[PDB]
Structures are given as C-alpha cells and as structure tokens.
Amino acid sequence: AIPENVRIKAFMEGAINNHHFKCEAEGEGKPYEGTQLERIRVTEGGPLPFSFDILSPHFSVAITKYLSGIPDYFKQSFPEGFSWERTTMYEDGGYVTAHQDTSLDGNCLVYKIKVIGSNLPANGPVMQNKTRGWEPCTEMRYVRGGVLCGQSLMALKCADGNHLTCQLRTTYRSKKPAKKLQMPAFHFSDHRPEILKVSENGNLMEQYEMSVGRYCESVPSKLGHN
Amino acid sequence: AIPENVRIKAFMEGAINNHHFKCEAEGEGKPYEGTQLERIRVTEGGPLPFSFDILSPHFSVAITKYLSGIPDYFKQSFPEGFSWERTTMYEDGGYVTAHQDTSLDGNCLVYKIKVIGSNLPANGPVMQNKTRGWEPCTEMRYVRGGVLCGQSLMALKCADGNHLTCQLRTTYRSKKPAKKLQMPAFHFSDHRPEILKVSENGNLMEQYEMSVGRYCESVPSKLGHN
C-alpha cells in the first residue's frame, strides 16, 4: 500500500541565519528500490546566500529499500502517514532544527518541511558557499518511547579538501497508533544524496538519493546477534 | 611489515566517576582478517562498580580488514607505531576521555591506554551495571590536519530494552612523517566488540572484535564517487 513508483511533491519554508526562503520540489521515486530524484526550485529568497547542501537532507524516508525482512515503520504508516523532527548540530556551531510531514495522495507523496538554522559562522564554508556536497552516511535506527529514533553523523565536502561534520538526531512518528505497527529491531540506514545538476542560476537543483535499510553484515557476531 | 598473526598485550589504567581501576589483557589477532580476541583481567578496583562495557571500545585499529584498496594508515605506520586520543559523550551527560599508545615488538602489539570518565549519572545504566553490550557501529574516517580523524555513534543495549547512545571523536596519529604515508580518501570502518565469556567471578572478560575498512557499497553513486 505504497505503489512501486510515485510522484513526490515537497514544500519547504524556513530561515537560515535569519534569511527566509521557500522552496518547492517536484519529483519521482521507487519506494521499494530506494531510489528517487527531486527537482527543487527556490521559489522565494533565492539564489540563496548560503550553501544549498545544508537543505539537501531535509528534502524522504518512505523511499528506502528495506533488507533482511526488517519491518518498515514508514511504509507501514500509510495511509495515515508520518512526521519527523530533526536536530542537526555542526561541529563549528551551526544549529538546524526541522519538522516535516509526509502524506500519500493516490500515487503522490506530499512533504511539508520547516527548517530553521542559526549560529552558522558568517565566514564558515556553508555561509561562504565553499562546500561540495555530502559523503554517504549511515544512520542508526531504534525504538524509543514507542516511536522510531534515528541518529547519524554526516560529512560535508569543502572546497579546500576538508570535511565539515555534523550530528543528526531524528524522531520519526507514525500517524498510526503503536499497537497497529510492527516495530523493527535496532538497525541501520545508508543514505547517499547527490546534486546532479544546478541551473536557473542556483535556483533549480536536481537531487538524487538512494537509501537502504539493513543490519550490519560486514562484521558477523560470534553470539548470533544482528 | 606487520605479521599475519600477532599477539596483543594491553595495559589500561584510569577511573570512572572516581572509581579507580586497572586492567591487563593478553590476546591475539589477524591484522589482515580484521579479527581479534583479548582476555581482559581487572587487576585493581575490582569488582567494578560500573559496567565494563564502557571500557570495551578502548581495548585495536591495526587489526582491520581493508577492502577496495583503501590505504591502511595504521599498517603503514609500522615499525614506528601510532597513538590515538578519543572523547566519548554519552547522551545522558557521561563523558569519557582516553589516550593510547600502540607499538609493535616482533609480532607482539603493545597497547598502553589511559581512560578517564566523569559525570556519569549515578542512577544511569552504566553505574547501575545494567547494560548488555554494544551494537555494531560504523566509524567515518577522513584526513584532517595531516592526521587521521574518526567519528562514530555507538549504542549500548540496556537490560530494560532501551539503548543508551554516545558520540566518539578520535584523532589517530602516525609516528611516521606524513610524506612517508599514502593517505586514504574518506571511508568507513565497521566495528563489533562482543563479550564472549565472563569468569574468575567477574574479573576476567574474554572480548572479541572484528573490524572492516570500506566505502559505502550499498548505495551506488550517480556521480562516480566512492
């Protein structure tokens, strides 16, 4: 009860260091193959005076290839849908909070996103546009207080060859009650967001992502643990 | 120039919430298979009034199966060796600092470890000794300041079914000069430390680990990145 191919519509509203903007996205994904493409236009407040990379991971967790029979908390949540709240702390003091709602309308995923960022250094790589996109990352996921939690570390490539790192904490909340859901055991999700193309003078980004839900298979347990 | 079969000698000393302890370990590893085993004896401050799990990840990064031809910063550093410094911040306020010196004598690796932990909640899982070992984890590794940096998030299982999480930051420092080293690109390492057995009335822990160095292979790049 999510189709194997869907449309995506997203609407973002936010502020980074008090610079307000809006975006709208139109795209498509394959929820069970874990692949998706979004064409994201900054409709208000652009071209942005800061790196678009900081917005990228706020623009799709129902689209994930879940391996090893791990229960899919997101796909299970339809038709009701879900939401999430995230906090991102950058190692240089940048601090980004976000809230998102996800619903499904026929074959269209609809996302509403609020992002507020503060305390980004004025002369850091984000405010100066010196960043070159994200490394892939792995997010840990586990159940806490009856909902799903995630955390990950991410690394942003910089022009000079450094990485700028951050820590993400997400609470995912199904709009179904807990007793209607099969909850997963502790596991991981890998993510790989990439900007494929920038046009309209920085106002139109084509962004691809793939994500995979799995246990750790590289290192087997001697105790039969996942 | 590190043998396929090595002995491990490790010596750890420190205090957690002002509870002094000391440990000696004897063990063995296969540096290219990424597998190892330490038999860890608590020789002072036993029986530990806190969970031994918080010590576990401080007891071996020369032992890693490196895939995809990634340059091995640690195996390259012999015969000179290397050291590391780490900080671990637990989500409940617990805070642990550590430093370590690693040398190779014949086929014997020798570790000297200093570990200091403070601000651990008195009624938290660690000090109540109510943890059940670590989930496997994924560390990101990248170059900074001419040395190697690592970061990870780890998750401790608790008796009540919850997880207590923490963030690690590690600076790894070769004793070879940089111009003698082939530096790796951004990559990951998976680690899985497990307690296989406990004996001598709780003063002897047998601890197994496997580590794998790698890129993210589950989510292919569309831009030809690793």
Author numbering:
A (entry chain A), B (entry chain B): 3 to 61, 65 to 231
Paper text:
As a member of GFP-like protein family, CPs have a barrel-shaped monomer structure embedded with a chromophore, and each protein monomer can assemble into dimer or tetramer structures.
In this work, a new BCP named sgBP was isolated from Stichodactyla gigantea, the giant carpet anemone. To investigate the blue color-determining mechanism of sgBP, spectrometry was used to define the optical properties of sgBP, and X-ray crystallography was used to determine the sgBP structure.
